[PDB]
């Protein structure tokens, strides 16, 4: 499944991401745009033998288990395949675990490079929330 911008904004809002750990809704929508182009099925191989999965591109070395990544840590305690659903619950739960303890949304390379310091509330403009 590929979400539309406002459809994802409404789903992320229902999943409690608005202002989660001080990050306004737009941040999460912007991150998903640049991480996966709102594609719940996105999978991308990294430079270190790991793969990023789903709409929020959760990493298979540190956060989810794919069984094919050396040095798996599985900190979210979830199979990476659970992040490939049309239902964003598992991806949201894992994003909430990543952002709670650390350097916020700096865990997302696309967010740091394309969302951070921009007018992120433009991502929720024109949406029914």
């Amino acid at each position: 499944k590929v979400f539309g911008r406002c459809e994802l904004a409404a789903a992320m809002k229902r999943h409690g991401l608005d202002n989660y750990r001080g990050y306004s809704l737009g941040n999460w929508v912007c991150a998903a745009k640049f991480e996966s182009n709102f594609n719940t099925q996105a999978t991308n191989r990294n430079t270190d033998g790991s793969t990023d999965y789903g709409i929020l591109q959760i990493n298979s070395r540190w956060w989810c288990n794919d069984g094919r990544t050396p040095g798996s840590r599985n900190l979210c305690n979830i199979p990476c395949s659970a992040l490939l659903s049309s239902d964003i619950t598992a991806s949201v739960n894992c994003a909430k675990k990543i952002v709670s303890d650390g350097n916020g949304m700096n865990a997302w390379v696309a967010w740091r490079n394309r969302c951070k310091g921009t007018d992120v509330q433009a991502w929720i403009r024109g949406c029914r929330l």
Partner: protein
């Protein structure tokens, strides 16, 4: 020499993103590589376009910045200015030969992006420069399909041509 060109290039990426006009001009004068790339594949022009620094965009283009430079997602500075809603930057990029129908790794054009964000004035400038209304991205969506998905009734009327 190419060593100093690349080294001043890194300072140029930072100055362009921060909106430091004087620093940008000094770095260019000192021989900074105007087409330097950061880890994300961004050039100083992508960063000035992303952050809305009109004067830096104009100055980079005057000193030979590649208008159609692509980052690791396949986005040109035009794609980024279109997403952000920077109308004056979109116009300058188009004036310097930006490819109005440049496609990223997801088959999206600047029109797809301006439509998604609901930037009406940018959509009209892109259409004026030949943006393809029938262009479908990798998921089969046209800019018109995107406007419908987001319920943008103003864009739906504008994109009917």
């Amino acid at each position: 020499h190419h060593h100093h060109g690349s080294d001043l290039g890194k300072k140029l990426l930072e100055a362009a993103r921060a909106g430091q006009d004087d620093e940008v001009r000094i770095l260019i004068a000192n021989g900074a590589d105007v087409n330097a790339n950061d880890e994300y594949g961004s050039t100083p022009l992508h960063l000035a376009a992303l952050m809305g620094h009109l004067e830096i965009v104009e100055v980079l283009l005057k000193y030979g910045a590649d208008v159609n430079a692509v980052d690791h997602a396949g986005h040109t500075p035009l794609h980024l200015a279109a997403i952000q809603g920077h109308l004056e930057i979109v116009e300058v990029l188009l004036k310097y030969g930006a490819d109005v129908n440049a496609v990223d790794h997801h088959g999206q054009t600047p029109l797809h992006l301006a439509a998604e964000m609901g930037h009406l004035e940018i959509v009209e400038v892109l259409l004026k420069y030949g943006a393809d209304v029938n262009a479908q991205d990798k998921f089969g969506k046209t800019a018109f399909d995107i406007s419908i998905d987001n319920g943008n009734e103003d864009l739906a009327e504008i994109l009917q041509k």
